[PDB]
Amino acid sequence: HGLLYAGFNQDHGCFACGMENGFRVYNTDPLKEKEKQEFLEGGVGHVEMLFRCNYLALVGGGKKKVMIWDDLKKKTVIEIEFSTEVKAVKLRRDRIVVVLDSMIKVFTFTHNPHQLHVFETCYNPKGLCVLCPNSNNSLLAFPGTHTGHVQLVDLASTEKPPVDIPAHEGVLSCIALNLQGTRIATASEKGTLIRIFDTSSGHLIQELRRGSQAANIYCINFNQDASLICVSSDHGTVHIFAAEDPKSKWSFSKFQVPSGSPCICAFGTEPNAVIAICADGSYYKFLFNPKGECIRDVYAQFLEM
Amino acid sequence: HLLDFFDIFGRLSSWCLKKPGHVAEVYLVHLHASVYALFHRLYGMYPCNF
Amino acid sequence: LIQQGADAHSKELNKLPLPSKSVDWTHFGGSPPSDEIRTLRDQL
Secondary structure, eight states, X not given: OOEEEEXXXXXXXXXXXXXXXXXXXXXXXTTEEEEEEEOOSSOOSEEEOOTTSSEEEEEOTTSSEEEEEETTTTEEEEEEEOSSOEEEEEEXXXXXXXXXXXXXXXXXXXXXXXXXXXXXXXXXXXXXXEEOOOTTOOEEEEEOSSTTOEEEEESSSTTSOOEEEOOOSSOEEEEEEOTTSSEEEEEETTOSEEEEEETTTOOEEEEEEOOSSOOOOOEEEEOTTSSEEEEEEGGGEEEEEESSOTTOXXXXXXXXXXXXXOEEEEEOSSTTEEEEEETTSEEEEXXXXXXXXXXXXXXXXXXXX | OHHHHHHXXXXXXXXXXXXXXXXXXXXXXXXXXXXXXXXXXXXXXXXXXX | OOSSHHHHHHHTTOSSSHHXXXXXXXXXXXXXXXXXXXXXXXXX
16 A cells, blocks of 8 residues: 555664655654655655655656655755666765666765766666765675675775675675674575675675575664674565574574565664564564564554554 | 975865865865965965965 | 855855755654764864
């Protein structure tokens, strides 16, 4: 019912939703609607936040124009348009990053933006890209031209050569970055193995296995101390893994959302909480014990709030 | 210390343009104002030398 | 033809790269990124 897109912000504390009539913004935990704005530009198919601030990046129904919206002024402040379709947008205090199906372009956050860099990628219809918003780390990471490789660039020291991480041997399905910008997670289209690398050296920090049968991977996210990750896959299934204990290869906890719809995942306010936002409009909250067993469960429809 | 003053002026005036990688633009407005004050100071005190 | 007045304009919140001009984290609440707090404390 109108839901075209959903996605977490940089601290996972909020998520934004693209609607056929506009966009919505919600607090992740506890769930609370923060804003709902009508914007009849064909419906919004991608919303990017910048933490909790007044600037949001919106992609219109034609998918060929990026619009920066100031929610305090209640108007679009910047428009960038493209001949090809925009697949994703990422934001930071001093840079606007736009992802296309074959390349990525970096612009200034000025009234009239100026294109600073362009970077080539493999065919990327999923819009895979991660950008660190921290002041001391302007890292950008994207899938390279080599199928299964991830390329990393520092947007501050752009003259430094890139890091080419040979993550997988097949097409990449998902990429995720930790809250400090030091560690990057990767997954292939087979969806059997998941790999964590150091962004500043390129080395394989941990490898994890989620199953034997092939399954498409929708979302991956770390917790604040980067000690745990959560991963989402078929029929709304989510797996929770330990990242810093190499004695563990499998997930210590697993759950499925009540409707079985696919979902994105992140960790909540409590250190033992995981939050799932589902494509049917469902909100789900999962609390676990150290053995991975559920101790509390909460479910709601966030579009009806 | 004339040439030290001059070289500091030159270095920091180049910094007003070349935008170091970890520096938000606010600081560079302050720095450009400071280097402008240094320009006035130096050119007033040492006109021919400067 | 503006050299020190530019500093006044910036502190009058008139012109800069847009988040660096007037970003405001009140829109979705919580606590600000401490990097922004540092940026203002340094500017102060």
